Amino acid sequence: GGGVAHGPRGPTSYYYMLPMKVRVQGLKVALTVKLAQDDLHIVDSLELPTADPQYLIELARYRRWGDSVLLVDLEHEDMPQNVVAATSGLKTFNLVPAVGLNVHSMLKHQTLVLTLPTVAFLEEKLLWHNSRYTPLYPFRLPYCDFP
Amino acid sequence: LGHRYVNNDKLSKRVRKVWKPQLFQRELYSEILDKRFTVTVTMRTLDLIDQACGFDFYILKTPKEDLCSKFGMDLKRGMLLRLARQDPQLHPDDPARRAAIYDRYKAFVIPEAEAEWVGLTLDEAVEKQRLLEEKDPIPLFKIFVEELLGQLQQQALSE
Amino acid sequence: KARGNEYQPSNIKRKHKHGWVRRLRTPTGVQVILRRMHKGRKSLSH
Amino acid sequence: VTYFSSRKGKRKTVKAVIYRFLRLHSGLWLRRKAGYKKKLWKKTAARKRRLREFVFCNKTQSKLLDKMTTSFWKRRNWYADDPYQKYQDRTNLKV
Amino acid sequence: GADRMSKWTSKRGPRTFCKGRGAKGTGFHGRDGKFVQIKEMIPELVVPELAGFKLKPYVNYRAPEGTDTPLTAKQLFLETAAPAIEKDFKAGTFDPEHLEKYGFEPTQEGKLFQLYPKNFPR
Amino acid sequence: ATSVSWKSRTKYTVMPVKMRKSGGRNHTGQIQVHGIGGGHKQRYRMIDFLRFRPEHESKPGPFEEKVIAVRYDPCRSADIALVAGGNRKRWIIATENMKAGDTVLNSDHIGRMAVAAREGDAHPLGALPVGTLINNVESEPGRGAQYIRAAGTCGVLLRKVNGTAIIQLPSKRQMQVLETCIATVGRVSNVDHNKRVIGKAGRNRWLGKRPNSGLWQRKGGWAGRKIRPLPPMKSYVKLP
RNA sequence: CUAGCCCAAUACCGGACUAAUCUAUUGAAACAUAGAAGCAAUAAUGUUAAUAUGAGUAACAAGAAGCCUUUCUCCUCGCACACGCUUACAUCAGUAACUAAUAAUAUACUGAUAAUUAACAACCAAUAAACCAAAACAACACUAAAACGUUUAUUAAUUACAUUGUUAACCCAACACAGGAGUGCACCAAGGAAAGAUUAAAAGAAGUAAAAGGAACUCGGCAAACACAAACCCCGCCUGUUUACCAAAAACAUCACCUCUAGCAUUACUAGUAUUAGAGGCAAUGCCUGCCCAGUGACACCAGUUUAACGGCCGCGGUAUUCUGACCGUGCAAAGGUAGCAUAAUCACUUGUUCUCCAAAUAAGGACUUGUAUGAAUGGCCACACGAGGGUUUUACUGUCUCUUACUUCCAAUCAGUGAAAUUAACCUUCCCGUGAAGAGGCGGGAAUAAAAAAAUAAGACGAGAAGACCCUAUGGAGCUUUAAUUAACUAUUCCAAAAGUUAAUAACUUAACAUGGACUAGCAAUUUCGGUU
RNA sequence: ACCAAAGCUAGCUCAACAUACUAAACAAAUACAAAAAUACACCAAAAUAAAAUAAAACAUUCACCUAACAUUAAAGUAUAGGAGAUAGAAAUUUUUAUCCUGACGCUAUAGAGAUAGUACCGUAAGGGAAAGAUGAAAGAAUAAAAUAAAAGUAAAAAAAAGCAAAGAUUACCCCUUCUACCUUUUGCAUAAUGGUUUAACCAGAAAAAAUCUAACAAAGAGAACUUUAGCUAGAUACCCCGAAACCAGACGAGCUACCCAUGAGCAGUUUAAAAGAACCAACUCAUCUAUGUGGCAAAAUAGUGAGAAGACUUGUAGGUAGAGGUGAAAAGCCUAACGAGCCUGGU
Ligand SMILES: Nc1nc2c(ncn2[C@@H]2O[C@H](COP(=O)(O)O)[C@@H](O)[C@H]2O)c(=O)[nH]1
Ligand SMILES: *C(=O)[C@H](CCSC)NC=O
Ligand SMILES: [Mg+2]
Ligand SMILES: [Mg+2]
Ligand SMILES: [Mg+2]
Ligand SMILES: [Mg+2]
Ligand SMILES: [Mg+2]
Ligand SMILES: [Mg+2]
Ligand SMILES: [Mg+2]
Ligand SMILES: [Mg+2]
Ligand SMILES: [Mg+2]
Ligand SMILES: [Mg+2]
Ligand SMILES: [Mg+2]
Ligand SMILES: [Mg+2]
Ligand SMILES: [Mg+2]
Ligand SMILES: [Mg+2]
Ligand SMILES: [Mg+2]
Ligand SMILES: [Mg+2]
Ligand SMILES: [Mg+2]
Ligand SMILES: [Mg+2]
Ligand SMILES: [Mg+2]
Ligand SMILES: [Mg+2]
Ligand SMILES: [Mg+2]
Ligand SMILES: [Mg+2]
Ligand SMILES: [Mg+2]
Ligand SMILES: [Mg+2]
Ligand SMILES: [Mg+2]
Ligand SMILES: [Mg+2]
Ligand SMILES: [Mg+2]
Ligand SMILES: [Mg+2]
Ligand SMILES: [Mg+2]
Ligand SMILES: [Mg+2]
Ligand SMILES: [Mg+2]
Ligand SMILES: [Mg+2]
Ligand SMILES: [Mg+2]
Ligand SMILES: [Mg+2]
Ligand SMILES: [Mg+2]
Ligand SMILES: [Mg+2]
Ligand SMILES: [Mg+2]
Ligand SMILES: [Mg+2]
Ligand SMILES: [Mg+2]
Ligand SMILES: [Mg+2]
Ligand SMILES: [Mg+2]
Ligand SMILES: [Mg+2]
Ligand SMILES: [Mg+2]
Ligand SMILES: [Mg+2]
Ligand SMILES: [Mg+2]
Ligand SMILES: [Mg+2]
Ligand SMILES: [Mg+2]
Ligand SMILES: [Mg+2]
Ligand SMILES: [Mg+2]
Ligand SMILES: [Mg+2]
Ligand SMILES: [Mg+2]
Ligand SMILES: [Mg+2]
Ligand SMILES: [Mg+2]
Ligand SMILES: [Mg+2]
Ligand SMILES: [Mg+2]
Ligand SMILES: [Mg+2]
Ligand SMILES: [Mg+2]
Ligand SMILES: [Mg+2]
Ligand SMILES: [Mg+2]
Ligand SMILES: [Mg+2]
Ligand SMILES: [Mg+2]
Ligand SMILES: [Mg+2]
Ligand SMILES: [Mg+2]
Ligand SMILES: [Mg+2]
Ligand SMILES: [Mg+2]
Ligand SMILES: [Mg+2]
Ligand SMILES: [Mg+2]
Ligand SMILES: [Mg+2]
Ligand SMILES: [Mg+2]
Ligand SMILES: [Mg+2]
Ligand SMILES: [Mg+2]
Ligand SMILES: [Mg+2]
Ligand SMILES: [Mg+2]
Ligand SMILES: [Mg+2]
Ligand SMILES: [Mg+2]
Ligand SMILES: [Mg+2]
Ligand SMILES: [Mg+2]
Ligand SMILES: [Mg+2]
Ligand SMILES: [Mg+2]
Ligand SMILES: [Mg+2]
Ligand SMILES: [Mg+2]
Ligand SMILES: [Mg+2]
Ligand SMILES: [Mg+2]
Ligand SMILES: [Mg+2]
Ligand SMILES: [Mg+2]
Ligand SMILES: [Mg+2]
Ligand SMILES: [Mg+2]
Ligand SMILES: [Mg+2]
Ligand SMILES: [Mg+2]
Ligand SMILES: [Mg+2]
Ligand SMILES: [Mg+2]
Ligand SMILES: [Mg+2]
Ligand SMILES: [Mg+2]
Ligand SMILES: [Mg+2]
Ligand SMILES: [Mg+2]
Ligand SMILES: [Mg+2]
Ligand SMILES: [Mg+2]
Ligand SMILES: [Mg+2]
Ligand SMILES: [Mg+2]
Ligand SMILES: [Mg+2]
Ligand SMILES: [Mg+2]
Ligand SMILES: [Mg+2]
Ligand SMILES: [Mg+2]
Ligand SMILES: [Mg+2]
Ligand SMILES: [Mg+2]
Ligand SMILES: [Mg+2]
Ligand SMILES: [Mg+2]
Ligand SMILES: [Mg+2]
Ligand SMILES: [Mg+2]
Ligand SMILES: [Mg+2]
Ligand SMILES: [Mg+2]
Ligand SMILES: [Mg+2]
Ligand SMILES: [Mg+2]
Ligand SMILES: [Mg+2]
Ligand SMILES: [Mg+2]
Ligand SMILES: [Mg+2]
Ligand SMILES: [Mg+2]
Ligand SMILES: [Mg+2]
Prior knowledge:
part of a larger assembly, 6 chains, B: alpha+beta, two-stranded antiparallel sheet, two-stranded antiparallel ribbon, E: two-stranded antiparallel sheet, 2 helices, extended, binds guanosine-5'-monophosphate, binds N-formylmethionine, binds magnesium ion, RNA-binding, translation
């Protein structure tokens, strides 16, 4: 009934931050491979005729998108209620806003769906780090050309 | 209570040392309370008294943190209550002397609502508040009679 | 000579040395009772 | 050496080495010769000059001093009128 | 060693340890060492007359029960004093200073069986 | 636990009272004096050391008492004597030749003529001749005879100057006191007390003397015949 | 040579794979790529649990017959109370198994039901006064001076029956333990059973008896004995106390004799007062205790005094023919070891020399005696009585021995029941010589060699037991002592300051009880240490 | 074939939030010797932390060490230190409200000690366990199915010779060859240590400088810094058990050492004697021998001894407590181990 020699000791936090440019390049590589492997589809306005999830199921089966679909919208409050109710009842069809795009989800879902404003937003957000300075103070603070 | 270095050298032995004050049994007379207290006071106490130009002056001027004495706080509370009440028991045969004594201590006049809570500890204050709030439970007969009288007055006025 | 029988029972000595009153009459015995209560002993004293 | 402090959990440095040594930015450590102030009437002028001259440390002693000092003493210092600013760097080192 | 979990009764001690078993005292010690028992300290069982009492330990099984209405102070007041005080106020002779006529008791120390000190066992 | 003393008796009585011995133990319970304990059961006979003590304050003059019996006392080395005068009896320390059926005088009057000193008589030092043997002398008037009491021991009056008497104690030391201090004349009873021979180691245990420790201790500088001069005269008069 | 996957390894170092889990994605007859770790046990006298060896071995028990609880054969710790344990007590029923160290059955296990009834015991007045005069058959006394009581006056609710302890075969020792247990009665009128059943090996324990001798045994007459006596020394006067659990003494204490320290009051000493009380030394008594204050202590705060205070009491050379030295010369000391005893319990030489004791003695006793290291209250010499103290003689006595023997009981062996321990790497576990980490069952060279039980002996397994207690090491401890190094607190001195004051026209002087700050001298003491090569 | 083996649950652990924090029960009795209705009082107390350790010793020093100011930097900087080991700020800066909380934590030698602070062990403080497994239904036990897999035995004792095996062989041995394994050593078969065996637990941990990989590059980093190819991120690294001891606070004088109260015993014989006299019982000690030595016994039995009216034995109750007590000094005894008790904490 004795103690443990080494064992696990307390809550251990496995926390580290990859460089911001490394994370941005990872996002770029994820988008590039999703496009090059015929697994990225650009849509317009993410509009749906009905809120039937079986409609999206049959549409993906007809278009041969695959088993898993990740639809990325521009904003959260600007999502149409049709697609919201159609994705709230599905598991393999996941609806995420633009700020919720990630390498893990892009690799988990076989097919990526991007709207035109989402594509423009992603391009504008990702191309900014190619010709930017090192942050004198955090970018949340007022800069000359940055919000 | 502390430590010290014998021979005043750091590299020498460290020794526990208790420095104690020189106590003296002196008799101090108060003008407001009119009584001579045989108290154990120190030369610093006598010096503070001479600096304040009076025993009552010293008591009324030095606060609790500078007195550090429950008896001193009790003396202050007593003389403050006497000054706030204008006690005729100071000099029942010398009203002029009583008034002359009460005038020279006018700068420390505190109202009665606060003059009886200065020299009290937390336990004493809780005990005083309990004695003040100690009320016997009124019988429910009185409450029911008052309710019935209210209902009867309402039925009498609603006609 | 022969050892082991060092305990000669007597209720007077028992209750006078390890009794409830003996424990409560001293501040150290009160601490003993408090420690036994914190551990949760079924019997705090004799 | 305190590898993990108790207050901040950081690595501390020994003050004796910073009191009797000087680190150039190129990794070299500068020191004084031991005994350059003891019994100067008993020593020859050549020996006294040898004692007064500064000297460098070898690789083992340099690594020891680097282990005993923190990273604050291995920084680039731009002092006003620093005599060792010309020696802070290394030139023509063909290794 | 001795036992600690068992109860410390009078059977487990010397001759000089004679602890009572919970009975109440009935007197004191007299002059010659004997015990003088006081007849006022012994409980007098007040037994009624059960001759013409037509009530049994059990009730009829077909008899109906009633909804649980625990008797409260407000209900007792409404039953004993509300009609009297109401009639007195309607007649106009109500006296708020004297409430002894309705059954209120100012001080319990006068009567025999007081309520707060609980002078009676049962 | 802290023990209580057996000396809780305010009323003076002639009958012997029981006393609880304690072997070197203070009121705490630890040994303070070694070699004490386990003696014979003894009673205490209360002795009246203030010899001149009138019965009533109405007649504070000198008084005469009669000796009833000279008895043995286990508490002190001397013999006690019961003396009765008026309505009370009292135990005093018997002198050398005090027998049953004697008269003892107790006086506080000092006159220009010295009085003839008998044995049982007790007069102030100012009224005794210049070469009188005394015992049970006092330090202050009315304090009580703390000084010489042991069996056979007696002091001697040396001189009286400026209303102050000088005595010499059995320790050959001079003691100056007021002349109004009462003192009993003669030697204390049991003059052969020093010549007694403890026959065996058991008589010491009977007396209540535990054996000495067996630890061998090397003598220090304290040992050796220290021929010290006689200390100065101990004076008890308060000179203003 | 033919094929290859193509050259040994301890400490440390480098690399490639990889078992089993969890997670993210695959997979879905149990896997892959990645990320994580409580990530792998032939070894710590490792922890827990279970199993074996020793081993069915050591050890343990119930007197006989009978008509079945009635008679015989034996030994005698029984009854009650106090203290303690709490129902283990009583009746009925059951025991395959659990408790009895085994059965029979049962006061000791199981279940149900009942029980110990107060007169005995516990709880069961204060306040003042009269009271000195022991218990011991108490007549009367001794010393060690001794517990135990009435009367008088004032108040003590007043009225049946209060409450509590009442069993036992029992308590403390891990146990149904050959142990430890207070008191009053008797020695049986009350308690019990040494043998489970056989045989009569060895060895072991207990007893009885023994020819002739009678200590010849042995360190010693230990033990035993049909004896149970008389003497001589050493050490302690004696009775007594001590290392519970290896030492009972010559150790300690002790009466006696000596030193120091104290002139005094409400908790020790002491309700005492120098014929007293403490701190000590040495040991009754008898004869004595010689010299020394140079050093260190203690009084004296410096001189000076103290050794029944700590302790010390001398060299070198010649001398009365040939041996010694009464004597002398010279030197140092504070005095230079006196009396006494002496080969001793007394450094070695020593088994000194001599006489008695024996046939023989390093034993014992008496003498001689520088013991150049005896010696006088850290006491020296004798003596009575005493001592489970240590030695030596004389008879008596005997199995101690010459030299063992016989028979009983417990053991032992067999049968039946129950059933441990240290120990154990695995053994299918010979002898000789040699070799070898220097003493071999395991190696080498030879001999021997069907396999298993049972009973004996202890030569070896460098046998078991206890991480050698001897020795050394450790920049490991602890106890003790100080002339070790740093110095506290506290207790006794002294001084200065503070405080209280007093005198005189800025000065001098005193401190009852406390009591603050800083110094001084001592007790009691605190922390730490004991260089290395050999 | 026995012994046995396997379940998945009881529950625990770490955090977040949080009302704001000594749960429920409290009829009577409970600090008389706790659970005992009931009489003229006394009640309360404080005075620094120490040491084990590091400085390879140890004397000044030795972070945390049961006292709030948290976070990002300044910064391990100024400073403090036998200026050694080590200790260590501040001025000045940063910190956006709520839900989104569960688990790359364990599954009965694990996770809390816990079925429980209970049995049990100690006088006491205190220490402190192990133990559960069928099924929808056992109101389905002439009860049904899966493993019959550890060590230990039975079925089934053995036949010259040998670290027990290997080369083999028609063939189990017979033939030939090899001095068990770890640890420690110059060197072990060594007769140097450790282990009967089985099962389950049981022992390497940190990123300063460096190497590899990658991002960006005279600039790097999501704020504070580093930069004469550098800056950022990731991966590569440093065990387990064991003293005598030291300090602090509790608990211990029911054994024993000594005292204080209160009681009790000593019969017979010789003696003008109760004479610390003599013989010898009860009683108290323990001289010598023999058994016993895991025994009846962690100190006993038998024989034999000493005292036995005393400085005697002994019952009950109380006191003296560890830097201490007590001691007719044995450095004895203080609850079976005392050159200084035991328990807890430092650990
Ligand atoms: N110092 C040192 N020890 C060695 C060396 N070689 C072997 N040893 C030591 O020798 C022992 C093993 O012996 P080996 O296996 O080399 O015969 C080990 O103690 C090992 O450390 C060496 O080269 N140097
Ligand atoms: C001497 O040889 C030794 C005696 C030690 S007893 C102090 N014997 C065994 O080690
Ligand atoms: Mg655990
Ligand atoms: Mg025990
Ligand atoms: Mg118990
Ligand atoms: Mg009782
Ligand atoms: Mg009883
Ligand atoms: Mg009655
Ligand atoms: Mg006396
Ligand atoms: Mg006398
Ligand atoms: Mg003496
Ligand atoms: Mg002595
Ligand atoms: Mg080759
Ligand atoms: Mg190799
Ligand atoms: Mg993997
Ligand atoms: Mg592991
Ligand atoms: Mg294993
Ligand atoms: Mg062993
Ligand atoms: Mg073993
Ligand atoms: Mg193991
Ligand atoms: Mg067997
Ligand atoms: Mg058998
Ligand atoms: Mg055998
Ligand atoms: Mg047998
Ligand atoms: Mg019991
Ligand atoms: Mg049985
Ligand atoms: Mg039964
Ligand atoms: Mg009975
Ligand atoms: Mg037989
Ligand atoms: Mg039998
Ligand atoms: Mg038999
Ligand atoms: Mg035989
Ligand atoms: Mg025989
Ligand atoms: Mg015989
Ligand atoms: Mg014969
Ligand atoms: Mg012989
Ligand atoms: Mg011979
Ligand atoms: Mg004999
Ligand atoms: Mg004989
Ligand atoms: Mg004889
Ligand atoms: Mg003797
Ligand atoms: Mg004699
Ligand atoms: Mg003794
Ligand atoms: Mg012994
Ligand atoms: Mg003894
Ligand atoms: Mg012995
Ligand atoms: Mg003896
Ligand atoms: Mg002696
Ligand atoms: Mg003499
Ligand atoms: Mg002696
Ligand atoms: Mg003598
Ligand atoms: Mg002399
Ligand atoms: Mg001198
Ligand atoms: Mg001198
Ligand atoms: Mg002679
Ligand atoms: Mg000799
Ligand atoms: Mg002989
Ligand atoms: Mg000599
Ligand atoms: Mg001598
Ligand atoms: Mg001497
Ligand atoms: Mg003899
Ligand atoms: Mg004797
Ligand atoms: Mg003897
Ligand atoms: Mg024969
Ligand atoms: Mg064989
Ligand atoms: Mg070899
Ligand atoms: Mg070897
Ligand atoms: Mg050989
Ligand atoms: Mg061979
Ligand atoms: Mg061979
Ligand atoms: Mg041959
Ligand atoms: Mg053998
Ligand atoms: Mg044998
Ligand atoms: Mg062998
Ligand atoms: Mg051997
Ligand atoms: Mg051995
Ligand atoms: Mg060893
Ligand atoms: Mg040894
Ligand atoms: Mg030794
Ligand atoms: Mg070393
Ligand atoms: Mg140490
Ligand atoms: Mg010194
Ligand atoms: Mg220290
Ligand atoms: Mg020491
Ligand atoms: Mg040394
Ligand atoms: Mg050495
Ligand atoms: Mg040598
Ligand atoms: Mg150290
Ligand atoms: Mg170290
Ligand atoms: Mg050391
Ligand atoms: Mg050390
Ligand atoms: Mg510390
Ligand atoms: Mg300095
Ligand atoms: Mg150093
Ligand atoms: Mg568990
Ligand atoms: Mg557990
Ligand atoms: Mg098997
Ligand atoms: Mg073979
Ligand atoms: Mg070797
Ligand atoms: Mg060998
Ligand atoms: Mg071996
Ligand atoms: Mg070894
Ligand atoms: Mg090993
Ligand atoms: Mg072994
Ligand atoms: Mg780094
Ligand atoms: Mg220390
Ligand atoms: Mg006792
Ligand atoms: Mg007799
Ligand atoms: Mg006798
Ligand atoms: Mg015996
Ligand atoms: Mg015999
Ligand atoms: Mg006998
Ligand atoms: Mg005898
Ligand atoms: Mg005798
Ligand atoms: Mg006690
Ligand atoms: Mg110490
Ligand atoms: Mg001591
Ligand atoms: Mg000694
Ligand atoms: Mg010794
Ligand atoms: Mg112990």
